[PDB]
CSV table of C-alpha atoms in Angstrom, one decimal:
chain,number,residue,atom,x,y,z
A,8,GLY,CA,-108.9,-106.8,-12.9
A,9,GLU,CA,-106.0,-104.7,-12.9
A,10,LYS,CA,-108.1,-102.1,-14.9
A,11,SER,CA,-110.9,-102.7,-12.3
A,12,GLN,CA,-108.2,-102.1,-9.6
A,13,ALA,CA,-106.6,-98.9,-11.0
A,14,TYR,CA,-110.3,-97.4,-11.5
A,15,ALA,CA,-110.9,-98.2,-7.8
A,16,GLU,CA,-107.3,-96.5,-6.7
A,17,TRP,CA,-108.0,-93.4,-8.9
A,18,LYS,CA,-111.5,-92.5,-7.5
A,19,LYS,CA,-109.8,-92.8,-3.9
A,20,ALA,CA,-106.8,-90.8,-4.8
A,21,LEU,CA,-108.9,-88.0,-6.1
A,22,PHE,CA,-112.6,-88.1,-5.8
A,23,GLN,CA,-114.9,-88.1,-2.8
A,24,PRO,CA,-117.6,-90.6,-3.2
A,25,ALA,CA,-121.2,-88.8,-3.3
A,26,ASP,CA,-124.2,-90.7,-1.7
A,27,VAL,CA,-126.9,-89.5,-4.0
A,28,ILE,CA,-130.5,-89.6,-3.5
A,29,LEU,CA,-133.2,-88.4,-6.0
A,30,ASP,CA,-135.3,-85.2,-4.7
A,31,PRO,CA,-138.8,-86.2,-5.9
A,32,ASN,CA,-139.9,-82.4,-5.5
A,33,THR,CA,-137.8,-81.7,-8.5
A,34,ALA,CA,-138.8,-84.6,-10.6
A,35,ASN,CA,-140.9,-84.0,-13.8
A,36,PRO,CA,-144.6,-85.2,-13.0
A,37,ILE,CA,-144.0,-88.2,-15.6
A,38,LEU,CA,-141.3,-89.7,-13.5
A,39,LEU,CA,-141.4,-91.9,-10.4
A,40,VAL,CA,-138.9,-91.7,-7.7
A,41,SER,CA,-138.6,-95.0,-5.8
A,42,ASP,CA,-139.3,-94.7,-1.9
A,43,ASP,CA,-135.6,-95.3,-1.2
A,44,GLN,CA,-134.9,-92.5,-3.6
A,45,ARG,CA,-132.1,-94.3,-5.5
A,46,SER,CA,-134.1,-95.5,-8.5
A,47,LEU,CA,-136.1,-93.7,-11.2
A,48,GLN,CA,-139.0,-94.8,-13.6
A,49,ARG,CA,-141.5,-93.5,-15.9
A,50,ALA,CA,-145.2,-93.4,-15.7
A,51,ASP,CA,-147.5,-93.8,-18.9
A,52,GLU,CA,-148.8,-90.1,-18.4
A,53,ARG,CA,-148.2,-87.0,-16.1
A,54,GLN,CA,-149.4,-87.8,-12.7
A,55,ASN,CA,-151.0,-84.9,-10.7
A,56,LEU,CA,-148.3,-83.2,-8.7
A,57,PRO,CA,-147.8,-79.5,-7.4
A,58,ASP,CA,-146.2,-77.4,-9.8
A,59,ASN,CA,-143.5,-76.0,-7.3
A,60,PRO,CA,-140.9,-73.9,-8.6
A,61,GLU,CA,-138.0,-76.7,-8.3
A,62,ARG,CA,-140.0,-79.1,-10.3
A,63,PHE,CA,-138.8,-79.8,-14.0
A,64,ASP,CA,-142.1,-79.4,-15.8
A,65,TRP,CA,-141.0,-80.0,-19.4
A,66,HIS,CA,-137.9,-82.0,-19.6
A,67,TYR,CA,-138.3,-85.7,-18.1
A,68,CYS,CA,-135.4,-84.5,-15.3
A,69,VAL,CA,-134.8,-85.2,-11.6
A,70,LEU,CA,-132.1,-83.8,-9.3
A,71,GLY,CA,-130.1,-85.3,-6.3
A,72,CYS,CA,-130.9,-84.0,-2.8
A,73,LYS,CA,-127.4,-82.2,-2.4
A,74,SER,CA,-125.2,-79.7,-4.7
A,75,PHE,CA,-121.9,-79.2,-5.2
A,76,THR,CA,-120.3,-75.7,-5.1
A,77,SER,CA,-116.5,-76.9,-4.9
A,78,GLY,CA,-114.2,-80.0,-5.0
A,79,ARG,CA,-114.0,-83.4,-6.8
A,80,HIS,CA,-117.1,-85.7,-6.4
A,81,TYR,CA,-118.1,-89.2,-8.2
A,82,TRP,CA,-121.2,-91.4,-8.2
A,83,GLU,CA,-122.0,-94.3,-10.2
A,84,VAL,CA,-125.3,-95.1,-11.8
A,85,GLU,CA,-126.5,-98.6,-12.8
A,86,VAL,CA,-128.1,-97.9,-16.4
A,87,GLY,CA,-128.2,-101.7,-17.0
A,88,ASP,CA,-129.9,-102.7,-20.4
A,89,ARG,CA,-131.8,-99.4,-20.6
A,90,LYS,CA,-132.3,-98.6,-24.2
A,91,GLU,CA,-132.4,-94.8,-23.3
A,92,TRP,CA,-131.0,-92.6,-20.5
A,93,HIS,CA,-129.0,-89.4,-19.7
A,94,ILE,CA,-127.3,-88.5,-16.5
A,95,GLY,CA,-124.8,-85.8,-15.5
A,96,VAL,CA,-124.9,-82.5,-13.8
A,97,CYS,CA,-126.7,-79.3,-14.0
A,98,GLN,CA,-126.6,-75.6,-12.6
A,99,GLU,CA,-129.0,-74.7,-9.9
A,100,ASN,CA,-130.0,-72.0,-12.3
A,101,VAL,CA,-131.2,-73.9,-15.4
A,102,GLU,CA,-134.5,-73.4,-16.8
A,103,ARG,CA,-137.1,-75.7,-15.1
A,104,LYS,CA,-140.5,-74.7,-16.8
A,105,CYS,CA,-140.0,-73.7,-20.3
A,106,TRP,CA,-137.9,-75.8,-22.8
A,107,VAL,CA,-134.2,-75.2,-23.1
A,108,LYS,CA,-131.8,-77.3,-25.1
A,109,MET,CA,-129.8,-79.6,-22.5
A,110,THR,CA,-126.5,-78.1,-23.4
A,111,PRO,CA,-123.5,-76.7,-21.4
A,112,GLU,CA,-124.4,-73.2,-22.7
A,113,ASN,CA,-128.0,-73.6,-21.0
A,114,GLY,CA,-126.0,-75.2,-17.8
A,115,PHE,CA,-126.5,-79.1,-18.6
A,116,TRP,CA,-123.6,-81.5,-18.8
A,117,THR,CA,-125.1,-84.7,-19.6
A,118,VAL,CA,-124.3,-87.9,-21.9
A,119,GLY,CA,-126.5,-90.9,-22.7
A,120,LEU,CA,-128.0,-93.3,-24.9
A,121,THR,CA,-130.9,-93.4,-27.3
A,122,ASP,CA,-132.5,-96.2,-29.4
A,123,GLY,CA,-130.4,-98.9,-27.5
A,124,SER,CA,-127.1,-98.3,-29.3
A,125,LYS,CA,-126.5,-94.4,-30.1
A,126,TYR,CA,-124.2,-93.1,-27.4
A,127,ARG,CA,-123.9,-89.3,-27.4
A,128,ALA,CA,-122.5,-86.4,-25.4
A,129,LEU,CA,-125.2,-83.5,-25.2
A,130,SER,CA,-122.7,-80.9,-26.2
A,131,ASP,CA,-123.8,-78.4,-28.7
A,132,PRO,CA,-123.5,-79.7,-31.5
A,133,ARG,CA,-124.0,-83.4,-30.0
A,134,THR,CA,-121.0,-85.5,-29.9
A,135,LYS,CA,-121.3,-88.9,-31.3
A,136,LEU,CA,-119.4,-91.4,-29.2
A,137,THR,CA,-118.1,-94.8,-30.2
A,138,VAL,CA,-118.4,-97.3,-27.2
A,139,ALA,CA,-116.6,-100.6,-27.9
A,140,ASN,CA,-118.3,-102.3,-24.5
A,141,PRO,CA,-121.8,-100.8,-23.7
A,142,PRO,CA,-121.8,-100.0,-20.1
A,143,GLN,CA,-124.3,-101.5,-17.4
A,144,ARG,CA,-122.9,-99.0,-14.7
A,145,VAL,CA,-121.4,-95.3,-15.5
A,146,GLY,CA,-119.3,-93.2,-13.0
A,147,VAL,CA,-119.8,-89.6,-13.1
A,148,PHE,CA,-116.8,-87.6,-12.2
A,149,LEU,CA,-116.9,-83.8,-11.2
A,150,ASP,CA,-113.9,-81.4,-10.6
A,151,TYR,CA,-116.0,-78.2,-9.8
A,152,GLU,CA,-112.8,-75.9,-9.8
A,153,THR,CA,-111.3,-77.2,-13.0
A,154,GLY,CA,-114.8,-77.4,-14.7
A,155,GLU,CA,-114.4,-80.9,-15.3
A,156,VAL,CA,-117.2,-83.3,-16.0
A,157,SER,CA,-116.1,-86.9,-17.2
A,158,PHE,CA,-117.8,-90.3,-17.4
A,159,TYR,CA,-116.3,-94.0,-17.2
A,160,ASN,CA,-117.6,-97.3,-17.7
A,161,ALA,CA,-117.4,-98.3,-13.9
A,162,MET,CA,-117.0,-102.0,-14.5
A,163,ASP,CA,-113.9,-102.1,-16.6
A,164,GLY,CA,-112.6,-98.4,-16.0
A,165,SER,CA,-112.8,-97.6,-19.7
A,166,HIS,CA,-113.4,-93.9,-20.4
A,167,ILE,CA,-116.5,-92.7,-22.1
A,168,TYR,CA,-116.4,-88.9,-22.4
A,169,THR,CA,-115.0,-85.7,-21.0
A,170,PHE,CA,-116.5,-82.3,-21.7
A,171,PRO,CA,-114.3,-79.4,-22.5
A,172,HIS,CA,-113.3,-77.8,-19.3
A,173,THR,CA,-115.5,-75.0,-18.3
A,174,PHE,CA,-116.2,-72.5,-15.9
A,175,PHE,CA,-119.5,-73.3,-13.6
A,176,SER,CA,-121.7,-70.7,-12.3
A,177,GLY,CA,-123.3,-71.5,-8.9
A,178,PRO,CA,-124.0,-74.9,-7.5
A,179,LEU,CA,-124.2,-78.1,-9.5
A,180,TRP,CA,-126.7,-80.6,-9.1
A,181,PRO,CA,-126.6,-84.4,-10.1
A,182,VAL,CA,-129.2,-84.8,-12.9
A,183,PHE,CA,-131.1,-87.9,-14.4
A,184,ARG,CA,-133.2,-88.1,-17.4
A,185,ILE,CA,-135.4,-90.9,-18.7
A,186,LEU,CA,-137.6,-90.4,-21.7
A,187,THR,CA,-138.9,-94.1,-22.7
A,188,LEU,CA,-141.5,-96.6,-20.7
A,189,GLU,CA,-139.2,-99.6,-20.6
A,190,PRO,CA,-138.7,-102.5,-17.8
A,191,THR,CA,-135.0,-101.6,-16.4
A,192,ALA,CA,-135.3,-98.6,-14.1
A,193,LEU,CA,-132.2,-96.1,-13.6
A,194,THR,CA,-130.5,-97.0,-10.3
A,195,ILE,CA,-128.1,-94.9,-8.2
A,196,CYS,CA,-125.1,-97.0,-6.6
A,197,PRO,CA,-124.8,-95.9,-2.8
A,198,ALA,CA,-121.5,-94.5,-1.8
């Protein structure tokens, strides 16, 4: 109510609303990107896709269609009652083919959920989160210049996690990851 209103006014004071669509050319071959490019599901097995260089071959990742090299940006993601997901940003230069650990040291800033109830930030070591109200909708907030990546419950304005301030190298991309085969898709909220 007031908390929702303050969350809305804070987004306006500081952050540009990003209109994020998923790039199917980046998506791991086990992922399905929806025809409107807002939603993500998983297949029972890898589909036959070209191994173009941008595609994540190991990690069940997909990128947005536009990168950020500067400024303050947010987008919101409907996670709904998914039991598993991770979202955030990654550098353009992340490893796409070989496994790397999804950590800030390797150019990934993500948080998410496993097994329905285990909220974690994928810092190294991983940060155990304690979340009083499981979010249905998550806001991702980027400040490129100050090296800030933070996450909020978009419905009640409660804070979830802020990574330590860092120094980004090169463009950042929105990144999305799902490991499970379950009924609820991951869906980006349009700007």
